[PDB]
Amino acid sequence: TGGSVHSSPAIGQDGTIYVGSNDHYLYAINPNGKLKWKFETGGSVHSSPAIGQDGTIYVGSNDHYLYAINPNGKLKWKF
Amino acid sequence: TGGSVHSSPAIGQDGTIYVGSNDHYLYAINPNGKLKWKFETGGSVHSSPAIGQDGTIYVGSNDHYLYAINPNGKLKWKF
Amino acid sequence: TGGSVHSSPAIGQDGTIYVGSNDHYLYAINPNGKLKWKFETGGSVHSSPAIGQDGTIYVGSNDHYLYAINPNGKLKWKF
Amino acid sequence: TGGSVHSSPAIGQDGTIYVGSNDHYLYAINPNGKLKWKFETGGSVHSSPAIGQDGTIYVGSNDHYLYAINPNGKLKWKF
């Protein structure tokens, strides 16, 4: 990545690794180490993502929002 | 929300997302992205919430306290 | 307790809530909100505690050590 | 260890306790308190490690990389 990784990673049911970074991105990485996708938030992602029963990834960001992201990398909703 | 989100989200038995924020509040969000309730502490909430077997949500705050909150949103006890 | 609580709490099998604080103490609290015991480290405890299979409570401190503490509240070892 | 321990410990399938430290190392410590191995990253390890189903340890570092480490303490890949 291009920023310090303060978020603690979470592992999806299929092995996908989700982690936030200081470059405003929540990352999704395959077990082989290559990028599944990346989601742009407004600020540093110090929150550690949590994975729902249906696969939704929830993580907070420094831009005041709690994000919900579908497993394909596009936004479900933000609070 | 109106504060930086450092707490990492915790997901309840029914899918309720709990996360703290710098605006002194512990938020509770429904899986559809709408507020269920919010509880106010006396400082920033950087601890990440932990959920018990009976649904109690535990979380710390900068105001020296450890909070226990029932799933309704009202205080159980503080330490 | 007394001090900013950055440690995210962990929940034991019997419902005991373990959390660290800046007062150099690791805290074990019963589900009712009363103190069970406290263990003193050499620095602030920002690490969130993790619980082993036999009940051992692992947590780190700013005094460079990782602490292993028995469920009764006494030192198992420190690294 | 050599630096402050902010990473939260994670427990493997065989009871191994994994934790990061500000000395740029990810530690693997047996339940008996003896060192199993330590893996050097570029910068401080604030991220709390996560463990996949095959035993891979995922942790973030201040050197911008997300690390995947085999159970034997050797690098699988970095992102």
Residue C5 in any domain: the answer is no
The pair of structure tokens assigned to A32 is: 């082989």
* D76, amino acid identity: K
Q: Give the whole-angstrom CA distance, residue B72 versus residue C5.
A: 23
**Is C46 labelled a binding residue?**
no
Among D1, D79, D10, D3, CA closest to D48: D10
- State the number of CA atoms in the 13 A half-sphere of C15 facing the CB: 13
Residue B2 in any domain: the answer is no
Q: Give the whole-angstrom CA distance, residue A36 versus residue A30.
A: 6
CB-CB contact of A38 with A57 (8 Å) = no
Cβ distance B5 to A62 less than 8 Å, yes or no, reads yes
Residue B4 in any domain: the answer is no
Residue D45 in any domain: the answer is yes
Residue C3 in any domain: the answer is no
Q: Give the whole-angstrom CA distance, residue C49 versus residue B7.
A: 15
* Structural determination approach: X-ray
Cβ distance A52 to B15 less than 8 Å, yes or no, reads yes
Question: What range does the domain containing D37 cover?
Answer: 10-78
Distance from D15 to chain C by nearest Cα, in Å?
7
Identify the helix (H) or strand (E) that includes residue A28. Answer: strand A25-29
Total domains present in chain C? 1
Residue B25 in any domain: the answer is yes
Whether B15 contacts chain C with CB within 8 A: no
Give backbone dihedrals phi and psi of B15, rounded to 5 degrees, phi first. 100, 5
Residue B46 in any domain: the answer is yes
Resolution (A): 2.2
CATH code assigned at A58: 2.40.10.480
**CB environment B36-75: b (16+ within 10 A), e (fewer):** ebebebeebbbbbbbbbeeebbbbbbbebbbbbbebeeee
Give backbone dihedrals phi and psi of A42, rounded to 5 degrees, phi first. -90, -20
Contact list in B for residue A76 (CB cut-off 8 A) is: 33
Instruction: Identify the residue among D8, D54, D62, D79 best suited for mutation to test binding to A, counting A beta carbons within 10 A and taking the highest.
Output: D79
Q: Give the whole-angstrom CA distance, residue B64 versus residue B45.
A: 11
Residue D55 in any domain: the answer is yes
Q: Give the whole-angstrom CA distance, residue D73 versus residue B68.
A: 39
Cβ distance A77 to B32 less than 8 Å, yes or no, reads yes
Q: Give the whole-angstrom CA distance, residue A73 versus residue A76.
A: 9
The pair of structure tokens assigned to B39 is: 């509880």
